[PDB]
């Protein structure tokens, strides 16, 4: 109890030294371990926000729906349910042997078990299915906004470019999942990071491009609506607001996740960006039905 | 009287007389 | 005959001013809570009676702003009120099939005197008017208009030459004659001592909701639900001036040159009688303006509305 | 600016 | 002398009379704010008297004291062709009770039109409705004989419950803004009809305060 | 990598030795340290769930609520915004020097910042305002559901008992707030949780009692509604389902929060139970309007 | 005119948005 | 069963 009396002292710099595979000493400061713990806590906060927002959008979509068995309704229920399931599996990863400082510092591979590898592969499979559901919803949105045009030259080309981007990022997420599953099946302490960054940049650019297509086509539809009167607030303004939201907000979150400092756990901001890119469609359907019935009421 | 013009006359006369515009 | 029209006779002198007629508000306050069903001036200009869907009949003071007497009612659902010219008798009826003569005395709100109650009608009683200190004329939803007495407490004569509900009644301040309206539109004048009808006028297939005699006593005006006002003469059986939301209430000034009128959604309006043109709409009231009646002396005007307010105007001869 | 990364046993967020 | 006259001399009697007038006015307004009024319009000779009698001239203020609540029922009567003039007075009321004599076919038709105009009048737009079919036993008796071709545009002879359900559907198919409307088949021996009016008034106030706080 | 070659060895029982104020040795196992980190991460998960659920309820309530400026709308918006602001200050607490393993293992008051003391006081103030908004909402709920009945003796008694429980809970939460704030401003290593447990049981019993009252009164209104016809699924059944939910589910979560094993960070399950007691009313308004316009327009 | 062609395009996109359930 | 516990500087849940 020598250092209690000292009024000026920094216990964040003091040395934790533990048994490890590099050596029996293995000294590290309290501030680096607290940075690790803050990274895990920030990941837990973002995945908690994801799970809670998806759970309540699932409840409100079950309650505030005029139409069920509708295809976009089913795609959105699959998307929100896969967000809930992926966040549940990520909560089960964060409170597990891999995330723990018993393996994040002391790299003893006996702590890891085959169940954690199975859960890892399951979480990657659920993320692949979630990206498939997101791209399915976006290609359905483009393929339903580009029907009806009488000059199908830029429309079919834009829809094929969107389908190519969607199947490209689903394939990139799929090959990233298979490559991570085989490299974890071989060695439990190995990682692949190139395919993840490729698939994440492909997903961000996919959401950006399809939101650009949606914003420009909704601007042209609103201009064609101004030719028919109709300067009232309508469903198309809600679609433009939520499309510009999915154009601006998760792009800014992706740029922020690539922009901020590393090793603080803020790299999972891509999840919150993916989450808002999902929630662009159910909240617009809720706002559209609410504005329809409230305008018929008013 | 049978003529309506005397009726109109007594209306306009009874409203014309004993008037002022002091405002 | 029909070729004589008041506007054509009045072409020699048109209006002098058509804007900014002086009207000074005196009171915007009440103790009422429900819509003013009726209000009526005493024969002297001192006091005004009023009632609402609440139980009270209030005597208001014209010069000051506060209340002299507030008489409760046996029937809460009153549609009409009256003050005797002797100003010791007060009358009420409507939605109860009974006309009630109270006596106001000793400057109190007790309503100690229910002098007489008359059960002769099997329908609502729309208009009440006083002839003298003893008689009381009322008109019903059934065709009868009965003149009860305070000593005798019985009917004298029943004029029933009308079909449909009689909505209002008119007595000139001066012979002793009355007039009534109806739903199947008629504006008969009666000498009121014989059951037959003295006169009749054009039907126009509308209901007539407001009747006033001219201040000289030789003319009659009748407002309707379609927004039309008739300006018939007491004699010769000729229509003179049509003035064409409906007219709920009318009155003339002491001069007789401007007519205060109440429309269903326009509001209170003033009409130039000679020109036949709108001069000085009164948008002061917050709610639907039930009625307007001017004073016998003419110095003041009284207006009442659905917002449970009284507005006393007091112009400098307007 | 930095490239995003995983950990050895971290799944794919 | 018709001026405002604020500084008049006998103001002591005026301020000793106006304040007792004002306390009387506020006393009776506070008395008549709490009460719950029921219109009971129906039509003439429809049997309003029977249902009010088992619940227990002109307008009859049939006031009750159930508990701390103080009811009031206005037995309207002497129906007239121009009720629209004086019907403005009953904006304040919580509900209209309506009584339909089931057996009378022409009175059924005229009462259907009267029910429509009182259901979609401006004054009762807030106020919910309660309906009473007065002649369930007479309609059960006389539904076997003489079906009327003004009723049943399309509807077999059957029992009386078929046809009665057509009537209880066309009454409910007449409210534009979906005000609360309750329906009852009452007879001359209907023991359970005061329960109906009390349950309807409590349901009315619950659905008029759960859309004033905002929960619905 | 001597024990990295070793196939069987348990690093969870391996011993960290670090310096502390209580003694130079202060040996600990990795199981205790990962217990600390897992409790902090579990708190972060539940508070992320709370923050995301409340934030998306605030967004959907801003989108799908017909009548704003009604009192229950303002109370719901205030309570959801206080859940968001409380969760935000709790995120600021979990990533800071009070919750860190620097202070939770080495009792050094030099690391404790007075800005963190201001954060602590602000968090207790926001918690007291949160319980005040919750009891305001439930007292308003009883005071509206007991109107209309003609025997105002059992209704006035139950309304007064509800107001008594609400005032007692708010006063006990404020007593806990000032009783913790003056001691934390005095001594940074002291606390007072018995008043906190009393106020938590008062909050749980207030939610349970007012939900019992609403369930019984809505079942009696349903049985008295069946007497007048009206056997369809309507807004009263929606209110009965949401009040039975706010009777059963948060009381079970309170029982679980008092039942589960300690030092696991599951004690903040009371914030999920109070979250669902908050969310019973906006979801009931959403369901009620989205089935009332359905039944009355479609 | 292009009134009618733009209105037909608007009706088809609104009807397919309503069928697919965004509106 | 366990009474709810607040850590020495933890705020109110
Ligand atoms: C109405 C439904 C469709 C949505 C709302 C409910 C879900 C958001 C909740 C309900 C039950 C929850 C689960 C209950 C228990 C667990 C186990 C839990 O496991 C651990 O923490 C393991 C730690 C260890 O083993 O050390 C991880 C979260 C999870 C899956 C929870 C994730 C979130 C779930 C699915
Ligand atoms: C319209 C609805 C449906 C969505 C609105 C969401 C936004 C209001 C949120 C979502 C993403 C959020 C951002 C996500 C991450 C960050 C980084 C965060 O941290 C830093 O910038 C670190 C600074 C430092 O190093 O001290 C500050 C808040 C910010 C910009 C957030 C601000 C609020 C944002 C824009
Ligand atoms: C719209 C909302 C209300 C949906 C409902 C979500 C919650 C009810 C879920 C989401 C996350 C869940 C938590 C996620 C993980 C855990 C850890 C779990 O503890 C362990 O397994 C850890 C054991 C160990 O320490 O080794 C206990 C349940 C709990 C608190 C779960 C409880 C239920 C929670 C709060
Ligand atoms: C789904 C919608 C309705 C809500 C979206 C909420 C998120 C956009 C918020 C909630 C939690 C926030 C995070 C909470 C804590 C942190 C850690 C903070 O980094 C630190 O630890 C402080 C800086 C340092 O230590 O140097 C940077 C911002 C960040 C990632 C925040 C970014 C914005 C987040 C993800
Ligand atoms: C009305 C709805 C749409 C609002 C949704 C946005 C919030 C959920 C976000 C926006 C900004 C976020 C905050 C941005 C930054 C921070 C600071 C962060 O703490 C730190 O960065 C470390 C502080 C320290 O060093 O102690 C904790 C989370 C918090 C409060 C975030 C909590 C979540 C907030 C309020
Ligand atoms: C609005 C409605 C749909 C909310 C429903 C919420 C439930 C689905 C959640 C709320 C709290 C949850 C519980 C919170 C904590 C736990 C403990 C958790 O971990 C243990 O039992 C510990 C194991 C061990 O001892 O190691 C298992 C799930 C369980 C029962 C959860 C099961 C799912 C529950 C009941
Ligand atoms: C104590 O610390 C040393 C590092 O100096 C470490 O090697 C040792 O394993 C620790 N434990 C014991 C029991 O000595
Ligand atoms: C940690 O390392 C330092 C380096 O010399 C050593 O002095 C200290 O004893 C070690 N810690 C423990 C607990 O042995």
Coordinates of C-alpha atoms and ligand atoms in Angstrom, one line a residue, chain A residues 15-17 27, chain F residues 17-19 24-25, ligand 8:
Chain A
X15 CA 2.4 -3.0 -15.7
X16 CA 0.3 -6.1 -15.9
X17 CA 2.6 -9.1 -16.6
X27 CA 4.2 -6.9 -19.9
Chain F
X17 CA -0.2 -10.6 -10.6
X18 CA -0.5 -6.8 -10.7
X19 CA -0.1 -3.9 -8.4
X24 CA 1.8 -5.4 -4.0
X25 CA 0.9 -9.0 -4.8
Ligands
LIG8 C1 6.3 -7.0 -13.8 O1 7.6 -6.7 -14.4 C2 8.5 -5.9 -13.6 C3 9.7 -5.6 -14.5 O2 10.9 -5.7 -13.7 C4 8.8 -6.6 -12.3 O3 9.6 -5.8 -11.5 C5 7.5 -7.0 -11.6 O4 7.8 -7.7 -10.4 C6 6.5 -7.7 -12.4 N1 5.3 -7.9 -11.7 C7 5.1 -8.9 -10.8 C8 3.7 -8.9 -10.2 O5 5.9 -9.7 -10.6

